[PDB]
């Protein structure tokens, strides 16, 4: 049950 | 479409844009902004002290609602 | 093959079962991925780990080019 994320900068 | 910023504060207060929300009201408030467009980018920001359990409760609410384009900001 | 990164309440960190810190994590990860940056990284943490800690780890992975992150 993962949640994908991007990190922004 | 225009990204939405979800903020969680150290007091665990939560906001969609400037609108106060809780787990039970967040998806209604978000749909007001996205008009239900699930491809809208959601940017999550939190106070440095917010813990992972809180983060995961918010992420799960968005995920079960079909909001899958999430960026973490810090 | 995906790699699991665990952060514990005391801020100790592991790649697989290998203890790591921010300055050694990418070497340890490259030993498992052979440098394949499309390898999925699953981040798991204790409930009390702070967002600051999560973001320090995410930034280290990000600056190294590991962009396929799942939170568990």
From TrEMBL, chain B:
Keywords: Bacteriocin transport, Cell inner membrane, Cell membrane, Membrane, Protein transport, Signal-anchor, Transmembrane, Transmembrane helix, Transport. It is a single-pass type II membrane protein. Belongs to the ExbD/TolR family. The accessory proteins ExbB and ExbD seem to form a complex with TonB. The chain holds residues 67 to 140 of 147 of the full protein. Transmembrane segments: none annotated. GO terms for biological process: bacteriocin transport; protein transport. It is found in: Cell inner membrane; Cell membrane. GO terms for molecular function: transmembrane transporter activity. This is Biopolymer transport protein ExbD. One of its GO terms (cellular component) is plasma membrane. Involved in the TonB-dependent energy-dependent transport of various receptor-bound substrates. The gene is exbD.
């Amino acid at each position: 049950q993962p949640i994908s994320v991007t990190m922004v900068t | 479409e225009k990204p939405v910023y979800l903020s969680v504060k150290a007091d665990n207060s939560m906001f969609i844009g400037n609108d106060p929300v809780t787990d039970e009201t967040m998806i209604t408030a978000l749909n007001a902004l996205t008009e239900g467009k699930k491809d809208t980018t959601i940017f999550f920001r939190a106070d440095k002290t917010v813990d992972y359990e809180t983060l995961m409760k918010v992420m799960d609410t968005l995920h079960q609602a079909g909001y899958l384009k999430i960026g973490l900001v810090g």
